[PDB]
Structures are given as C-alpha cells and as structure tokens.
Design an enzyme around this catalytic site. Structure first.
Site, PDB file in Angstrom:
ATOM      1  N   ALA D  66       0.723  -0.960  -0.005  1.00  0.00           N
ATOM      2  CA  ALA D  66      -0.296  -0.070  -0.319  1.00  0.00           C
ATOM      3  C   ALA D  66       0.851   1.735  -0.143  1.00  0.00           C
ATOM      4  CB  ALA D  66      -0.965  -0.178   1.378  1.00  0.00           C
ATOM      5  N   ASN D  90     -10.434  -2.837   1.189  1.00  0.00           N
ATOM      6  CA  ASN D  90      -9.802  -4.662   1.290  1.00  0.00           C
ATOM      7  C   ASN D  90     -10.914  -5.330   1.130  1.00  0.00           C
ATOM      8  OD1 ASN D  90      -7.288  -2.679   1.644  1.00  0.00           O
ATOM      9  ND2 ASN D  90      -6.508  -4.161   3.036  1.00  0.00           N
ATOM     10  N   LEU D 115      -0.398  -5.679   1.656  1.00  0.00           N
ATOM     11  CA  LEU D 115      -2.008  -6.322   1.360  1.00  0.00           C
ATOM     12  C   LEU D 115      -1.027  -7.385  -0.517  1.00  0.00           C
ATOM     13  CD1 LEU D 115      -4.807  -6.677   0.719  1.00  0.00           C
ATOM     14  CD2 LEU D 115      -5.045  -4.088   0.117  1.00  0.00           C
ATOM     15  N   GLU D 147      -4.466  -8.920   6.842  1.00  0.00           N
ATOM     16  CA  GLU D 147      -5.156  -8.412   5.117  1.00  0.00           C
ATOM     17  C   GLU D 147      -5.043  -9.413   3.918  1.00  0.00           C
ATOM     18  OE1 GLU D 147      -3.229  -4.921   4.589  1.00  0.00           O
ATOM     19  OE2 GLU D 147      -3.304  -4.073   6.804  1.00  0.00           O
TER      20      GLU D 147
END
EC number: 5.3.3.8
Lengths: 260, 257, 259, 259, 257, 260
Positions: D66, D90, D115, D147
């Site tokens: 990110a 997400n 992520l 995540e």
C-alpha cells in the site's frame, strides 16, 4: 465519547445502553452515515463494562423505513469505486457491529422495519413488539438488490427456509402472525401505534424488573457461547452479501427503481 | 451394571428403559448419578437387541436438576475440574453420541442439567400441559450446560432461547408445542407418573410393530451427523467456560439459598 | 431432451413448468423418471429466461414415490446391481434439486411419499391444494433409510424432534405439522378433484406476484440462501445413497416391496 | 473500464494479463489501484474466452504494498473515514481474488509486501523470477493485523508454525520457505534486471503448456478446488477488515506510516 | 498462584515464562501438574502486560509425558472420568484457547500428552537436532490426546501422522524440519538446557523490539479461528473415547512395564 | 464371501487384508466393474474383525494406468442416464468405500498411478514406494474431465494448494520429489521396477515386524478420530465430483479425446 447525531440519540441507565431512533417525521429512514453511527454506538456499548443490555428503540409509527434513498441519489474514478465506498463500506461495517456485539441486543419494534433496518432487527437477540401491526419487509426483489445485513442467514434461521423464500422472492412482508409462529417476538405489548414513547418506557420498566436477582455476567457468558453457533455463517454472509450487491448497484437498476 | 438406589433400568425386547425413582427429592441428581446415567446409556448402546432407550421418571417432577447438597484438591480449579467438568463432559457426551433412539417421558418439570438432557433426547412425550423446562443458569451464576448452547436454539429457536436464558424464564408447555418439542401430550394426571410411563411404553410397543428397527438406527446415524460437531464443540467449551464461574464462587454463594 | 409420457414440461415466460401426468398410477416414478426429472431441472437451470421452476402434478396424489414394479425389475453382484439401479439415480436426481439455481416451487396437489416427498422437501416454496395433503417418508416400514436429502431437509424444515417421531415410527408429516413449521406458503383450499384448476390458479397468482420485480434479484438472493446448507446437503446425498446400499443388498426392502 | 496509468491489461488468447507498470515506485498501490485490480479480475471473470488471469509486474519489486503517501491523504468520524478508505477497498479487492473463477497465476518478479503480498498468496500458481523473491507481511511493525485473507492463506500455504514466526516477528517468507512449502511452481532463474523478459518467458511457457488441454476442465476443477476454503476466506475477509478498524482509529498505523 | 516444586514461572516484561524444573524425572508430569500448567496459562492469559507465554524445561528431556507412578469411586468409569478425562479436557482447552503467543523451547524429547502440548504451541525452537516428539498411544493401548487428532495432521501432514501414530514411531527432527514445525534450531549442547533457554529469551527480546505487540495478539486472535472449532470438537471426543481404553484395562496392564 | 475377479485377488494374513491388482500386461487398467469390486473388497475387509490393515498392492511396472477406456467405449433412454449408470455409479461407490474405510489403508506403490486409480492412492492412509520413479498423474485436463475420487480434497490436503493447481491445470505429474517434499511417501524401498513381487513381499515383511507389541484396536480408534478431520469434506466432494463430471461426459469431449 462520540459525536452527536440528530436522528439517533443514546443514554445509559444502569446496565442498559439505550439507543433511540428519533426521526419519526421521516419514518426513521437512515442514511449511510447514520448506519455507521449505529455501528459506532454498538461498539461504544460493547466496551462499557457496566453495560449488559443494548436496547434499540425508535419513534413514531415506523421502527425504520430503511435506507434513505434521497441520500443514495446524492470524486470517484468509477461506479464500482463509488459503491464500494458508499454501500459496501457502511453495510459491511454496521452488519459486523451487530453480528459481534457481546451485550444482549434487544429491539423494541414500535412499528414496521424495512430493508437494512429490518435486517438489523433480525440480528437482535430479543424483539418486543408494540402491537400486532408490526411487520418486517425486505423489498430487495422490488429494489433490484439482494440480501443485506446478514439476512441471508438470519431470515432462514428465524423464520424458516420456505417462509423466507416466499417473502424474499415475491417481496412480501414477514407479518406479525409469521413472527409469532416462529417465536420471533418474545412479548407483544398490545399498545396503540401512536405512542411509541409509552411502549419504549414500558419495555424498559419490565426489563428493570426482569434483571433483578440475575447474575448479569452469566447473561454475557451465555451469549458468548450462543453466538458461536452461527458466527461463522454470519461473517461469511456479510462479506459475500456486500460484494455480490455491487453488480446490482453498478448495473444501475436500484437507482432507476428507487427513483420512483 | 452396579446398583443405584436413585436410578434403575430394565430391558423389555428392543426397549432399554431407565427409571428415575427418587420422587421424594424430585429426582435431584448428584454428580455420580449423572455419571451412572451416562454409564447406562453406554450400556444400552452396546446392547445389539436394544433399539430404543427410554428415560422415565417418577412423582411430580422429571428431575429438579443437580443436587445442591452434593455441591456443598490443591486448588479451587482442580476441585471443580474433578467435580463439575468431569461429570458434565462425560454425561453430555454419552447423550450426544448415543446411537439408539432416545425417548424422554416427561412426567413433570426438568431443571438445569436434567433439562439439558431432556433437550438432547430425540423424542419427548409429556404427561400433561403443566410440564416445563427451566434452565436457571443466570440465577445461579452459571452458563449453559449439557449442550444447551446448541440444543436450545435448535429446538426452540434463537430469540426464544435468549428470552428464556437471559431472564431465567421457563420453556413452558405452550412454547414446547409451538416448536414441536413434544411429539405427544398424554393429558394424564400428575398424581400417577407410573400409569403415564406404562401408557407410553404400551403405545411404543404398538408403534414399532412391523417396522424394520435397523432402519430406525440407520436413519438416526445420519440424522445425528447434522449437529454432532456443534454438540461436541459445545460440550468442551461449556464445561471449561463454566469453570471461572465456579472458581469465582458466585454459584456456591447463590446455591445455599 | 427426449419425451417422457409420465412427465411433461413447458415454458411460460419466466416459468419452467414440470408436470407429472400419470394420475392413474398416482404419479409413481421409476428410476428413469427420476433421472428425467433431474434432466429437466438441469435444462431449466441452463435457460437464462427461466427464473422459476414449478413442479406440478395430477390427480389426487402428487406422487406415491418410487414405482415398486420398476424395483422388482447382467450385473456381476447384488452390490453392482444396486449401485446402478438405486445409488446412481438417487444421487443424480437429489443433486439436481440441491444445486438448482432457479426458484423451485412445488404445487402439492395431494400426498407425496418416499423419494418424491424428499424432492418436495428440497423445493424452496410449496403451495397446497387443500388441508388433506401430507408427506410420508416410509423408510422404516420399507427397510430403508433417509433418501433425497431428507437427512438434512426434514430437521431443517420440520424440526429435529418432529422428524424423529415421523421417521422412526413411519408417521406422516400432516398438513397441521406442515403449517406449524411454515412449510406451506399458501393453501389454496380447492377440491382435490381438480388438480388442474389448482395448478392453473397457482400460475395465475405467480404471474401477478412477479410483476414489478427484478427477477435477477430473486436468483441472486437464492444463490446466497443456497450457501446456508449446500455443504450439508451434498455431504448427506453421498452418505444416504451409499449407506442405503447395505439395506438393498441385505434384501429387506425387496422382501417388503412385495407384501 | 477506465484506464489506470499504474496498471495495464490485455488479452492474449485464453490469457487475461494484468501488468503493474510503475517500477519507479516499486509498484506501490493506492486504495483506488486495489479497487482497479478488483475490477480487472471481475472483467477477466466475465470474459468467456479467458481461462487464466496472469498478474505480472515490473522492475525489481512485484509490489511494495500500500502506498503510504495515499494513506496520509469530509468524514464525520475517524471510524467513518477508515470504513471508507481502508475497510471498503480491502474487503472488495480481497473478495475479487477469493471468488475469481479463472486460474490465477502470479509472476513474481521480485518482493511483495503487505496487501500486495496477500494478493500473491491468493493466487493459484506462482512463478518466481529468481531466488531473491520474498513475501513480507509487516503488520506487527505497522500496528495492523492480517489483511487480504492472509489469516487463512498463510497457514494454508506455509504452515501454522511458520506463519506465526513470520507474522509475530515481522519476518519475510523467504524463497527457501516458499520452496519448502511448494508455494512456487517454477523458478525461472533469470536476472531481476529484466522482469519483462521473465514475464514474456512465462507466457511463452504457458502457451506451450495449455496446448492439447480442454480448458473448460481447468475451470471445472478450479470451481471444485475453490470450495475447499471458500467459506474460511469469506469469513476471514469480513473479520480482518472490521477488526483492523480499531488499529486505524487508535492511530498507531499512521504514527508508524510516517517514520 | 499456588506453588509447584516441578513447575515455576516468572514474568519478564511482556514474557510470561513457565519452567519445568524436575529434570531428574525427565519432567514427567502427574495429573495435577497438567492442571497447574493449565492454571498458569490461564493466569498468563489474564495478564494484560503479557504478550508471549514461553514454556521452557530442564535437563535432557522437555518432558517424558504423563507420570506412570501417578497413574498406578463407585466404578472404573467414574475413576477415569475424574483422573484422566478431567485433567485432559482442562489442560488441552487451556492451550487451545490461550490468547498470548505460545512458544515452546524444546530442550529435548517430548512424549505423550506433553508432546501434544508442544504441538499446540504457536512457535517451537529446538535446542539441537536430537529432539523428537513421540506419541506412543498405540503401544500404550490408548488413542490421541491433547488435540493431536487435529494438530498432528495439521502440522506434520496426514500420511506422516498415520505412519507415526499407527506404528508408534517418533516425529524426528528431520520430519519436524520438513514440515516447518521448528522455527529455529539453536544447535546447542544438551548438557546445558539453561543456556539454551537464556539464549532463546535473549533472541526473543531482540525480535520484539519496535513491534506493536497488540498486533501480535490481534493477529493470533484471527489465526486461532482457523482451527478453533476442530480443536474444541477433538478435545471432547478424544477424552471421552479414551475412556473405553482405560476401562478395558489395557493401558494399566501395559503401563506397569 | 465374494465373486472372483481375474484382475484383482485378495487374501488375509493375520491382521492384514491384502488386495492385489494382478493384471500387469494391461498396466492394471480397471473397468467400472473392477472399481466396484475394489469397493466391495474394502467393505469386506471393513467387516472382518480380525483385520486391522488393508493393504493394496499391484503388479508389474504400473500400480494402475487408471480407467480402461476400451471399457468406456463399450439400453439407455439418454446420454445422461447412460453416464449416471456407467460413471456416476461406480465413482461415487468406490470413492465412498475408500473414504469411510475404518481399517488402516496402505498402498504399495509399485509404479505410476493414473486418474481414478491415482485418486484412490491419495485416499490411502500410508503409501510406500518401490523406487523414486513412481509418480501420480491426474490427467483430467487432457481427458476433458474434472477431479475424481475425492482428489478435490485429497490433493490440496496432501500436496498443497499451489502444487495441486500446477499439476491439475497443466496435466503434470506429482512426481516422486513432490511426494517426498510433502511427506506423501512414508518409506521408499529403492528396489528395481521389474520386481513388484519382491517389493510387495518386503513391505509385508516390515509391516509384520512393525505391528509387534502394538495394541491394534488403538490403531483403529486413532484412525476413527483422525478420519473425522476431513470426512465431511470428502463426502461433500464425492457427490459434487461425480455430478459435475456428467456434463463433460454428456458433452462428449472425453469420448472424443480418449479415443486417441
């Protein structure tokens, strides 16, 4: 502490965290940020160690007419991004707040509930009805949408599979008689629809009596185990519901429909 | 196989019949009586001639639940592991896994762990409309026992279960009927549990005529698989999570009065 | 698809209508008729204009279940025989119902028994012609066990304790039990001498009810609803069909199916 | 679909190829870029000529995760802000990967973090450019939690104990750990100065490998394979995204994301 | 909170350190020592300053398992419910539910229930390549314990688990490494477990620097949900299904020699 | 008691029920009725209280080349009915026989296994290999079919997800090195491929040694618990696999393909 919301108030009385929908002139229709506010209120109640019951009460003749589609009609690189932020966001958050809430969640159904608001009613642990004119309506088929707020799971669980299909597929209400035949309502107070205040007060009055002598941590301990029965199903349904709804929003059908 | 003055049993053809026979104390059961019940079920389960296990009682109550007298080790935790955890995981498991058709003849109210065992039975017949089940956990400073975490929402619905469990309210006869918990109400007087018990057995003898009894067991084997994992999960969690309640002391404080 | 003299189908708008049309034999179905039903569901499921699959029947019975004459009628073992004649067909038809993506509506013009009653229990919505309808799952009296996903469907739709009473003792799920569990969405209260009039009134009423609705929403919602119990049904199908084999091979069902 | 300057796509036969094309910023992705990825997967998924969705990148990194600058950049509460900026995006992108029906192949030209590394772990097949690739899930050092379905994917693909060591102490899943768990199907052993040559050789090799195959079988098999963990992934997505909120609202991640 | 001469504990910052300190008997544990372990975990779990629970031992064995001496009531069933069922469901549950990061410092072999507890830990560090886990259930006339039904296939694979469990063969160091069961081998001499234990703690102090420790716990909370239901199910089934083995008498017959 | 099958024999030695595929000239390719026979043998072993281990052994250089498609090429009102009887029937039955088997199931892999036969290898509890040239091939993508015999579950379980996708999607073998890296093989005997007899005898020899002193009911008791880990997943996969394969058979692709 938390911001003020002119459509939703709260107070704490002893072990009760009481949330009050206070916009009867608009049938307690809720915008996206109001659903987020509801979720934040639950999370606040959930962190208060003095609180054992979270009671959701409303006002006027409707519990809630559901999502405010004036707010829906009212910056994003695509339609998908728009609806991810405006719909997916708030639904997944508020639904989760209800699914995980550790305090005993009681809904005082002062009138009909519709759509996402009706979904939240169906996630409460206990529901009391003002009178036999209450109903829940999940108008997804007429709106061009699908199940919301964990109704994928809650409606079969609490009303039965076949009843759920009839209601959801043909946009028919879960009426009072259906609620009673499924033990959805724990008590009907049989009061006039014009006095949600007297109804709300009466429920609180009886709750104060019913909790006397109870070991309240036992209530929460039991809820913690009971929740485990369906927690996974609810969490699975929440992410799938919000994501599968996206194609309906992006297609445009719901905007086209709830314009009128 | 050992004798118990509070619980007898007999085998009549395909029926293994357990009889609670201490009506003077409302068939209250100590820890070792719950274990004996478990051993009886396990005995019935090994008997290849047995297809039905029928639990009957005596007097005006089916059972008032755990004997408070019997309630009153290097730690509190060790004591309650031996006294509560052990007995509860064992008896609950004996009911959960039982392969024979399990029928309860409800001659009166059942409370607590005894009521939990009633809820684990496959079929329940009531003597009359005054029977009820009470799970007074909230009043006793305890939590769900005997698989009620699963059985009560399953058989009475989720919302009804919360109302009853959170506020210590009975599952009355009307709620039993509205959920089809009772398969037949015999509408017989409570002053004669023995006659009720005999009538149920008479009716069962008639109902089994001409059926292929191995089909009953084959069907139950599959039916049981619907919720077996949930019941087993609930059993270990229930017994271990109750420990903090016993250790805190609240149930003992409340059990005295 | 081939024609079947005992089962017709047609499409009216969003409705794929299956019609059991052998009232003289109470719409008893042989193995190949169940397969044919499976095939119709699968055809309905691939038609993008179809949103509802409506199963209708004829005469005084919905279906008396599996045709006993067909059961009485080239295999190296009894096991191989029953894997072919029973296991194959039950696992296939049950799967067709379990996975069907269209809204499945049963018009119950009379009693259903056995595997046919199992199929009624796999439908999403059931309408009754009158209060004399019942479902009977006579497995205990036939020397068999649960079929057609009833292992899951009966506790789901009638409750565990009721299911045991009925299955263990070969007792019907009567109209009152159906109503007490919300199994029937509407009773039309029409004479059982005119299943055809009942069938037509259901379709009339459904044409009314679908008006205004976004039909893809119905299917989207069913897709999610199906996920509640899909695993349990699929696991049940496999186990029911295989565990029934020992009953057939032992011979008890055949011994009973001619008494 | 709209154009994105950081992510391109094209279709070559049965292959839908996504290409991260911002090597100067190590293919760091802002919220809207993840949404865009989700949208591409969804487009690939609706294309009946597509059987494989190939995710490729550029330069020395697959993706550094990110974009921190995007995080630093009209909401009535912090909760509302993070529901919109983090939870929304997400839950959407993770869902797009989880449900994708086409065979998802990652061409790992270098490290993936955060992520982005979660997305690599949701792919079905991974090819490495060389033995210097790693995955890093730095959640413990960022003040965050799992995540992109890593709650499920990491124990599934690397083992429980390895996952704890790496996640609890902010340690990479290095190439050797990847190989020991069969995470990488082939290492191409090419210089990391030419991700483009690597990307082309993977596609050349895939053209070879698909020859003769019945491509609908690939998708039919994936449909069944997906059913193993679909429930766990969907349940994880919901919980990860909501449980992360308290971390964002507390402010620890922002306090760390500018150090 | 009570004292145990075979098991001590101390808290150093975010680490709650449990130390098995009976190397002369290879840290064999009686039933009440297993319960004490459970109580220690539950104590660590209530401590808001604790993020890691580290189990360390002493001498050449981590633990030889259940004390056979301690192994040698109205029935056999009641006795084994109190002695075996109770202790096993309790300790196993304490490990299954533990919310802090659970690290085992494997200073030597672990056997039986002790080896089961090693398999429930989140992270395992080995002193050297001579460590092994042995689950000698088949040789003892018993079945899986301490959640090994789930943990062994999970962490070693299904086929490997069958080979080891069916034929009473150890999970040796090489199989541990091939399955990533061990996160670091310290390659230190077995003649000094204390130095190994100190080195692990030194390394952990360094590794935690600059991390947000609540993230560790938040992550574990989610990770735990992958298999929590399976572990809870396995716990009640394991303890109840072992009963018939104890009651039959076979384990006692074998435990003497 | 049971009928004779010229391609599959069995015998019982002490606690071992030994099944032997004895058609090496045709690489132990199996027809539909041979798979049913295998299932019947398992069910026979399962009812024998003296049996604790069921050992499947083969002959020649292949364990089994899989389904005999001469028998596939060789009365039904439709194509669906044909394949329900000829494919769905035997797959669902044999797969179930393996999934539920209560005795310890050991495969002696004397050579490669392909397709449904390789699926059955993957359902065994323990696998021993003759040498490092063994492999498993699941050629479904090249045959125009999908996963069979519970491989939907067994292959990810025993080889990992990513490896499984590479192998299944591109029709690549699970080679010996992949088996070893996943602990699929418990022992490699490292014997020449030309003497499956000596291999089969050697495995039995070692098993007779390994069982000494064991309480064999403990083996079965443990297997009973271990099975519960994935039993539901296997049963779900079995019915779905056989039913989803039907469209491939009825489309005709597999007939068109394994003609050549």
């Amino acid at each position: 502490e938390i911001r003020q919301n002119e459509k939703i108030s709260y107070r704490i009385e002893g072990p009760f965290f009481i949330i009050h929908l206070i916009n009867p002139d608009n049938l307690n229709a809720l915008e996206g940020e109001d659903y987020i506010y509801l979720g934040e209120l639950l999370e606040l109640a959930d962190r208060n160690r003095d609180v054992y019951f979270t009671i959701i009460q409303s006002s006027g003749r409707f519990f809630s007419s559901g999502a405010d589609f004036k707010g829906i009609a009212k910056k994003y690189p695509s339609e998908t991004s728009k609806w991810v932020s405006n719909f997916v966001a708030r639904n997944v958050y508020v639904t989760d707040a209800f699914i995980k809430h550790s305090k005993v969640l009681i809904c005082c159904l002062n009138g009909p509930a519709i759509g996402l608001s009706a979904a939240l009613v169906a996630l409460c642990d206990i529901v009391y009805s003002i009178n036999d004119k209450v109903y829940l309506l999940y108008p997804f088929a007429n709106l061009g949408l699908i199940t919301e707020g964990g109704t994928t799971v809650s409606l079969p669980l609490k009303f039965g599979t076949n009843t759920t299909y009839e209601c959801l597929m043909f946009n028919k209400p879960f009426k009072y008689d259906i609620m009673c035949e499924n033990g959805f309502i724990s008590k009907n107070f049989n009061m006039p629809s014009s006095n949600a205040e007297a109804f709300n007060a009466k429920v609180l009055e009886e709750l104060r009596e019913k909790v006397k002598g109870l070991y309240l941590p036992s209530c929460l301990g039991m809820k913690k185990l009971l929740k485990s029965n369906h927690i996974d199903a609810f969490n699975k349904a929440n992410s799938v519901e919000v994501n599968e709804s996206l194609k309906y929003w992006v297609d445009g059908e719901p905007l086209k429909r709830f314009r009128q």
